[PDB]
Write a structure and sequence with these properties.
The chain is 42% helix and 17% strand. By secondary structure, it is α+β, with helices and mostly antiparallel strands. The chain is globular, with a radius of gyration of 12 Å. β2, α3 and β3 form a beta-alpha-beta unit. The protein binds one RNA strand through residues 15-21, 39-40, 42-43, 61, 65, 70-77.
RNA sequence: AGCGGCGUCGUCGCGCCGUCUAAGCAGCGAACCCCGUGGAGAGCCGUAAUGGCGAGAAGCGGGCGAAUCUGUAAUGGCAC
């Protein structure tokens, strides 16, 4: 769940941000969508409406950010293609 | 700067006054704010200053939106 994200950011297709994740989920190219625990409830409506598997993240977005490689905060992130990673195995 | 008066004038050519125009009506809209795109971090964008940013910056479009300004009212008043 944690080390897989390192390879998901190293290799494969990923997009950071709520809106681009919405677009990827509606398009369906995003195989899985990863969300932080304390995200606003306004985002969960799409993540349930979208058929994409909903991988929870136990932490908050504040520490989700730095582990993903970005100093800022990450609310909802999608990985379009895993490539050299197995975070999808964590999700499905 | 030009035009019309008044003053001074031992010498010079300066000094002062005037050269106006209401509400109403019609048009335009600076900031803030709202929306559609946009995809920015070993960092970028700004302010007199505080600052803003994947919970979406810069940039690009659209919308709501001031005083005041432009025309008319424009023929009234002036040593017409």
């Amino acid at each position: 769940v944690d080390k897989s994200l390192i390879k998901a950011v190293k290799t494969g297709k990923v997009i950071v941000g709520a809106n681009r994740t919405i677009d990827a989920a509606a398009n369906g190219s995003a195989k899985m969508v990863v969300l932080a625990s304390n995200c606003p409830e306004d985002i969960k409506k799409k993540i349930q409406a979208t058929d994409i598997p909903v991988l929870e993240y136990e932490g908050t977005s504040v520490e989700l950010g730095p582990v993903c490689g970005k100093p800022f905060t990450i609310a909802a992130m999608a990985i379009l293609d895993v490539g050299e990673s197995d975070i999808l195995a964590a999700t499905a």
